[PDB]
Design a protein around this ligand. Structure first.
Ligand SMILES: CCCCCC/C=C\CCCCCCCC(=O)O[C@H](COC(=O)CCCCCCCCCCCCCCC)COP(=O)([O-])OC[C@H](O)COP(=O)([O-])OC[C@@H](O)CO
Ligand SMILES: CCCCCC/C=C\CCCCCCCC(=O)O[C@H](COC(=O)CCCCCCCCCCCCCCC)COP(=O)([O-])OC[C@H](O)COP(=O)([O-])OC[C@@H](O)CO
Ligand SMILES: Cc1cc2nc3c(=O)[nH]c(=O)nc-3n(C[C@H](O)[C@H](O)[C@H](O)COP(=O)(O)OP(=O)(O)OC[C@H]3O[C@@H](n4cnc5c(N)ncnc54)[C@H](O)[C@@H]3O)c2cc1C
Ligand SMILES: Cc1cc2nc3c(=O)[nH]c(=O)nc-3n(C[C@H](O)[C@H](O)[C@H](O)COP(=O)(O)OP(=O)(O)OC[C@H]3O[C@@H](n4cnc5c(N)ncnc54)[C@H](O)[C@@H]3O)c2cc1C
Lengths: 393, 393
């Protein structure tokens, strides 16, 4: 275990909170700096497959999380134009048996608050309203600077400052790559939404998709609309605005079009990712979460990847640190990097392809529809790589 | 039977020859006018599925045709970039059992000469070097004008003057619609072509395909390359020239690229079709063959459709004419039109989609490839509509 280790975490999102919890459960001294003045996430849904569920259970927080979550029966793909079901992924007991946990959906804010509170309970020292302005390595320590003039010493630091990470600049000059798709969200009271839904339902169509699922044991309905923005292709800086919505879904089924009216219009998420990179480490600093591997939303695994990052790091560290102390941190970081890069980078890359597959038109959509419909649903070859992965060695 | 009937056929291609044979076998008086000074087709291959094979057998000419033909074992689809097999259609005995004939390939010129000779043997009067310049209906007869100043009387006339039919102008002002794909052909001695091929092999790729099959009992190899012409999209009148070939296949596998060198470069077929039409009849004139339903090459059924046209017409006429004589011709023509239009027009329309499916790129090609690979090969749902059709009533 990590009793003698000091780790500093720049960033307090799902990633940084998950890592605080994982490490402090191992007895490490953890200090986390979050820029925002309170901890919080959007009060909208996210999806957490069994690859994340499992890990939350090993942390002892899954039951509590499930008590405020929803357990869908299936993932259902529908054609966005005809509303016709193309296929289902069964989330029943064979699925739970094989992957070792439920696929569930919950409020981001609830999941985030659960991890913060459990990190706090495990002994992690968390600080809001504090921006990390620099990390360098000197001798065998990470030196972290904060925007109040202080510097802090630790054995390693974790750069978990998200998609627009400034700590990533130590390792790479790349910029975010726009997919040209904008994402809108909504949460409505179930009853108020205009039949019944017990699943994650994804309507896929040319240049768009529309996702729905219940939350809080059937009481809320989350809705997400993602569409290709004409404005991005014409050079607009603040592209994807709400005026584009109606024209974006005009070709789609009524079920999809009714859905548009429940969305929040005062805020949206233009969708970026980054080209995959191999190396995430700089001396005694490692990038994790969106800072190292920000994906497009299609595999619903960005936050799950950060959760995996946390487990892997804590597991690899607790194994190696017991015997070689502070001196072993760089080898540990490297080994975490080697395990995590291939896995996460395939998600980045396959996520782009999967997304493109949702958005086909013309003859390509006919082929796509028929491919989904005629598949062997007992086979797990499209999904084992994603849901069946573990970092255990 | 049709002993008392006089039919005039404008056009002497596979269509018009097939119709001469069908009708003269029923005892009709047949006169055919062909514009070219000799009968002949290109000395290159075509494909004749069981939907045409069957009919040739009922005419008594299939055995003779088969003695100069090739019988492939399969239709094999390969990815034009990787050369990887995507799927096969088995042409074995289950296939022959179900559809009632072989799928075969032969020289167009051989098939054409066989039908001409058998039409001649059945009593059809054939005339080369004679252009039909007009057909009108008067009272209960078709009056046909020829480019030597003569007019000719018959009970009906068949307009089988091909893709660029001028008789079609009596019924419709439409023009040929360019697909923007150009087709090149080649026939090489089998041995001289650079492993072994016993099938129809179709390499499908972005913006192109390349088809191969043996002829004359394994002695020749037919090769066909079809590619999207950059020149068509830029407004060139005589588009699809041979200079475009190399760039068109540069992205493809070596097997495909070696293939390009065997093609005839001094002649090519830019590919046109026409929007489907319902009505083919004008008084006592019916359009048949390419004049009524010219397809793109993808289902390999243009000439087969003309062969079906012949059978249907002769069968429907011999049934109805025995009892109501010359007076029944318009009702006969209408009934042939009603049987044949839905069938042929679905071929026109599905042929476009099938073609587009061959030419996908990007993620769409990945979906397409996987769709071909994972299909139930024992199922016949993609093919019954095409190969299992009969006009028998
Ligand atoms: C179960 C999903 C239903 C849709 C299935 C269609 C998916 C992909 C079609 C094209 C992929 C062809 C790749 C073939 C090779 C292959 O299977 O590799 C296999 C891996 O394939 C892959 O890597 C396939 C990548 C496709 C990802 C499927 C996504 C899983 C579901 C995510 C949905 C969550 C959010 C939903 C929100 C509505 C390895 O197989 P092997 O036989 O080599 O071993
Ligand atoms: C056996 C061909 C292998 C490739 C199969 C993939 C074909 C098409 C994929 C997309 C079509 C989805 C249409 C689904 C509905 C359907 O099956 O309709 C069915 C009809 O489907 C169709 O109409 C499918 C149209 C596709 C044509 C297949 C072409 C046959 C082979 C021609 C090749 C000759 C030349 C080759 C030269 C290399 C009706 O089914 P139902 O269940 O309603 O009754
Ligand atoms: C529309 C949409 C839907 C999604 N759905 C899903 C889903 O269903 N399932 C799923 O698993 N994933 C999903 N994701 C991905 C997921 O939201 C992210 O991958 C995940 O939140 C990344 O977490 P993170 O902690 O690495 O980074 P972030 O969550 O971006 O948090 C980084 C934190 O660091 C703070 N920060 C920044 N700079 C500094 C600094 N210098 N010092 C201190 N703090 C700093 C920020 O304030 C922020 O709180 C989705 C993403 C989007 C856009
Ligand atoms: C590259 C390519 C590959 C193909 N492969 C296949 C295949 O594999 N299988 C298949 O089944 N089909 C195939 N086809 C389709 C097939 O070639 C045609 O559909 C078929 O030949 C049409 O026959 P037709 O007799 O109706 O018309 P045409 O064959 O065009 O013949 C019409 C005839 O009428 C004559 N004519 C024109 N005007 C007059 C007039 N005023 N008076 C007298 N005569 C006139 C012309 O000289 C011509 O001989 C292919 C086509 C192409 C372009």
């Amino acid at each position: 275990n990590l009793q003698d280790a000091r780790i500093i975490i720049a960033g307090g999102g799902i990633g940084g909170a998950a890592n605080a919890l994982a490490l402090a459960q191992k007895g490490a001294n953890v200090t986390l700096f979050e820029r925002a003045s309170e901890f919080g996430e959007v009060g909208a849904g996210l999806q957490v497959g069994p690859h994340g569920a499992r890990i939350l259970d090993s942390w002892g927080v899954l039951d509590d999380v499930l008590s405020r979550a929803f357990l869908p029966k299936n993932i259902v793909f529908r054609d966005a134009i005809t509303a016709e079901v193309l296929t289902k992924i069964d989330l029943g007991s064979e699925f739970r048996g094989r992957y070792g946990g439920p696929y569930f959906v919950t409020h981001r804010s609830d999941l985030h608050a659960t991890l913060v509170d459990a990190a706090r309970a495990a002994g992690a020292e968390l600080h809001t309203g504090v921006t990390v302005t620099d990390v360098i390595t000197e001798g065998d320590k990470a030196i972290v600077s904060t925007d109040d003039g202080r510097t802090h010493e630790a054995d390693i630091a974790l750069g978990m400052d998200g998609l627009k990470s400034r700590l990533r600049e130590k390792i790479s000059g790349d910029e975010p790559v726009s997919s040209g798709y904008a994402a809108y969200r909504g949460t409505t009271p179930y009853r108020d939404v205009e039949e019944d839904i017990e699943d994650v339902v994804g309507y896929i169509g040319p240049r768009c998709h529309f996702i729905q699922y219940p939350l809080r044991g059937g009481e809320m309905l989350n809705q997400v609309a993602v569409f290709e923005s004409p404005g991005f292709k014409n050079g607009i800086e603040n592209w994807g605005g709400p005026e584009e919505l109606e024209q974006a879904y005009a070709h789609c089924h009524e079920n999809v079009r009714r859905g548009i009216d429940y969305l929040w219009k005062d805020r949206w998420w233009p969708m970026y990712d980054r080209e995959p990179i191999e190396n995430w480490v700089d001396g005694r600093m490692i990038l994790l979460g969106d800072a190292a591997h920000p994906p497009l939303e299609y595999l619903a695994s960005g936050a799950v990847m950060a959760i995996e990052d946390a487990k892997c790091l804590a597991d690899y560290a607790a194994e190696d640190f017991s015997t070689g102390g502070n001196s072993a941190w760089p080898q540990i970081l490297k080994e975490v990097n080697t395990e995590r890069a291939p896995r996460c980078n395939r998600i980045l890359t396959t996520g782009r392809m999967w997304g493109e597959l949702w958005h086909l038109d013309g003859t390509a959509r006919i082929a796509r529809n028929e491919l989904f419909r005629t598949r062997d649903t007992s086979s797990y070859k499209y999904t084992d790589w994603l849901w069946g992965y573990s970092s255990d060695r």
